[PDB]
Design a protein around this ligand. Structure first.
Ligand SMILES: [Ca+2]
Ligand SMILES: [Ca+2]
Ligand SMILES: [Ca+2]
Ligand SMILES: [Ca+2]
Length: 381
């Protein structure tokens, strides 16, 4: 009965999270530069997390309007690679939230660097849609291959022009062209490994030209970077208990109505329209892209668990519970009545009997007025 409340509450919070993806890069103006922080670290093959801190300074080559502080969601995937990673394909979509850069742009990149004293060069070519929010690139190790460390340390080094910015957030990167921009970056990792990166971005002949210089040092030789034990960048996650996994499985089942192990944009659209929302099919698609961790073009249960485990501060946990309450509290009068509850459960796809609805109210109603107020809801969730 309490389980029924948690099933429903988790599903509504899932919709909330699907509609609000973790920040990837936090942007902030400072000292005449646009700076950023990234708190994502690296998922290890053993399931653990290898923490990183990444600080970047971006600086246009001519004076350009700085924006106010904002957020970039970025999803980067390794689309393919040869056996030893000397040739790699990656792709990414990026979006900012609170004439010469054409609709379609190609780029060329050249990296030279060193990690624990291992010198290498990479040459690459990419393309995408700078306003739409999409890019792909093919990278090839031209010297020092095969690389004796995780590709993941290089992937975020290879394209800021390809970030969709809304109209009221100045696009520092796009506005800097044709002359372009430089960046500098420092990454610290939890075992003391360090990487300094310098980048130059310009526009020649209609093509973006990227130059990168990277120097990594102090990685332990048995550590996960030098032993290739990493699997992509991920945000910090909480550990889930066995019970929670059970709960979240039930919440998942309300979306996956056909039972195929996968949630689709159709299945998600269906629950979201019953709930009275109407997101556009571009939007439903974006929502699944952001949580499709393996990039196989489906949203499955382990990926649903990842979303539900993302580490969130207490302001933010509390806001999401407030938000869940507002969905159940259809009229917004601060009380969930029987009829409001029945309708939300039906909307979620839990068909319930009158008496089951009564027991749900009965178990949540501390003060006995026949409705559930916010404090009583919190107690449930
Ligand atoms: Ca399904
Ligand atoms: Ca997937
Ligand atoms: Ca109400
Ligand atoms: Ca009550």
């Amino acid at each position: 009965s309490r389980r029924k409340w948690n099933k429903a509450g988790h599903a509504v919070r899932a919709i909330g999270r699907l509609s609000s993806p973790v920040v990837s890069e936090r942007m902030y103006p400072e000292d005449g530069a646009l700076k950023s922080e990234i708190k994502k670290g690296l998922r290890l093959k053993d399931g653990g997390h290898y923490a990183a801190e990444v600080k970047t300074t971006y600086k246009a080559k001519k004076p350009v309007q700085l924006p106010g502080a904002y957020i970039v969601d970025i999803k980067l995937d390794i689309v393919s690679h040869n056996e030893d990673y000397t040739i790699v394909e990656q792709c990414e979509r990026a979006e900012g939230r609170h004439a010469i850069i054409k609709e379609f742009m190609r780029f060329k990149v050249h990296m030279e660097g060193s990690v624990n004293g291992h010198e290498f060069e990479i040459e690459g070519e990419g393309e995408g849609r700078p306003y739409e929010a999409f890019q792909t690139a093919k990278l090839k190790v031209t010297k020092g291959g095969p690389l004796p460390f995780a590709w993941d340390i290089l992937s975020p080094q290879f394209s800021k022009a390809y970030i969709k910015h809304p109209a009221d957030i100045p696009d520092y990167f796009k506005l800097s062209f044709p002359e372009g921009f430089r960046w500098e970056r420092v990454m610290n990792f939890e075992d003391g490994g360090i990487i300094h990166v310098n980048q130059d971005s310009s526009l020649q002949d209609g093509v973006f030209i990227y130059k990168v210089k990277l120097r990594g040092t102090n990685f332990p030789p048995d550590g996960p970077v030098m032993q290739k034990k990493t699997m992509g960048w991920e945000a910090t996650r909480d550990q889930l208990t066995e019970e929670q996994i059970a709960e979240f499985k039930e919440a998942f089942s309300l979306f996956d109505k056909d039972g195929d192990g996968t949630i689709t944009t159709k299945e998600l659209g269906t629950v979201m329209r019953s709930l009275g929302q109407n997101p556009t099919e571009a939007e439903l698609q974006d929502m699944i892209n952001e949580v499709d961790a393996d990039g196989d073009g489906t949203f499955d249960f382990p990926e649903f668990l990842t979303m539900m485990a993302r580490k969130m501060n207490d302001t933010d946990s509390e806001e999401e519970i407030r938000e869940a309450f507002r969905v159940f509290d259809k009229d917004g009068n601060g009380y969930i009545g029987a009829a409001e509850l029945r309708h939300v459960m039906t909307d979620l796809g839990e068909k319930l009997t009158d008496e089951e609805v009564d027991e749900m109210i009965r178990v949540a109603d501390i003060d006995g007025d026949g409705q559930v107020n916010y404090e009583e809801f919190v107690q449930m969730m």
